[PDB]
Amino acid sequence: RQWTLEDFDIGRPLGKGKFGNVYLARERQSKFILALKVLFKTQLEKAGVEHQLRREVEIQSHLRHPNILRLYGYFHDATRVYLILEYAPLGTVYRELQKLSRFDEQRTATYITELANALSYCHSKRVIHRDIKPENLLLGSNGELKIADFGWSVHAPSGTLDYLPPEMIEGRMHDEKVDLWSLGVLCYEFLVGMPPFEAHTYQETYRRISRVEFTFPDFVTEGARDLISRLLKHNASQRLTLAEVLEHPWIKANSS
Ligand SMILES: O=C(Nc1cccc(Cl)c1)Nc1ncc(CCNc2ncnc3ccsc23)s1
């Protein structure tokens, strides 16, 4: 179907960045509710990202998983590009973490399981996400995690610095293990309420990631310390596999 903007009723903003806003939308004919992200062509070409966008759409025509948000298609006009997305009724994990401050051990491990299942599938098709962070994790109507925004994704091998591994911040070669590090940064932020290498400047953060300089607060349990520490390894190969995450005593104990 050759979609046009007139096929939709547009509703409230769902979110917004400086690439474009996301709006609630309803397809006029079916009454189907979805999300429309409105990207400006000027912004995309002035940043030379039009190719990464074209690849995202292409990657998202193949990926089908309950824990990956759907990109149903796209259409353009004179000035803007419109992405046709699955609506995530419970919003972002980013907003949920701001509200709750931090996540208990049970909801953390459940998210990490859902994220690990999504990434396991992605890594099978040789797709690496590279941009795992709370703002790209959204919540389905049953509170289930969905990974979103495949714009920075690539086939392996190939904002803030908080979630990026050493091999990536140092402009070097990298593979799947990128997502494995980001999963460990997430586990930590879920539990603590802030990411492990947080600093007030880009340059302090960069120093902390490459030297892997992080400490745990008192309340983090030994099983969680163990998971996170086996994930946040400078040497990519030493890290841990998704299968080792999913079969981890802490995940098994606490995941629902
Ligand atoms: O942005 C891109 N690609 C992109 C953008 C700019 C440049 C390039 Cl190169 C690529 N892709 C995305 N895929 C999913 C996205 C999530 C949109 N947000 C939401 N979607 C559904 N429900 C809710 C509810 C709360 S927010 C929200 S964004």
Side-chain angles (χ1 to χ4, degrees), residues 14-15 19 22 35 37 39 44 49-50 52-53 56 60 69 71 83 85-89 91-92 136 138 148-152:
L14 283 170
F19 267 119
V22 183
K37 196 185 189 171
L39 310 164
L44 295 163
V49 293
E50 291 194 308
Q52 306 170 211
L53 180 60
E56 175 184 9
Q60 285 275 252
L69 195 86
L71 215 189
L83 308 181
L85 294 153
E86 182 181 349
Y87 167 53
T92 60
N136 291 151
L138 307 195
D149 197 331
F150 278 82
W152 279 111

Side-chain angles (χ1 to χ4, degrees), residues 141-182:
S141 57
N142 296 254
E144 76 278 25
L145 183 138
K146 335 205 98 166
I147 195 171
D149 197 331
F150 278 82
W152 279 111
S153 59
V154 296
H155 296 79
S158 188
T160 172
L161 233 47
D162 282 312
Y163 310 87
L164 293 177
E167 60 270 31
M168 208 157 161
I169 66 163
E170 291 166 3
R172 311 168 53 218
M173 176 85 358
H174 55 264
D175 61 354
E176 292 79 21
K177 297 294 204 185
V178 160
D179 292 335
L180 273 293
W181 168 283
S182 290

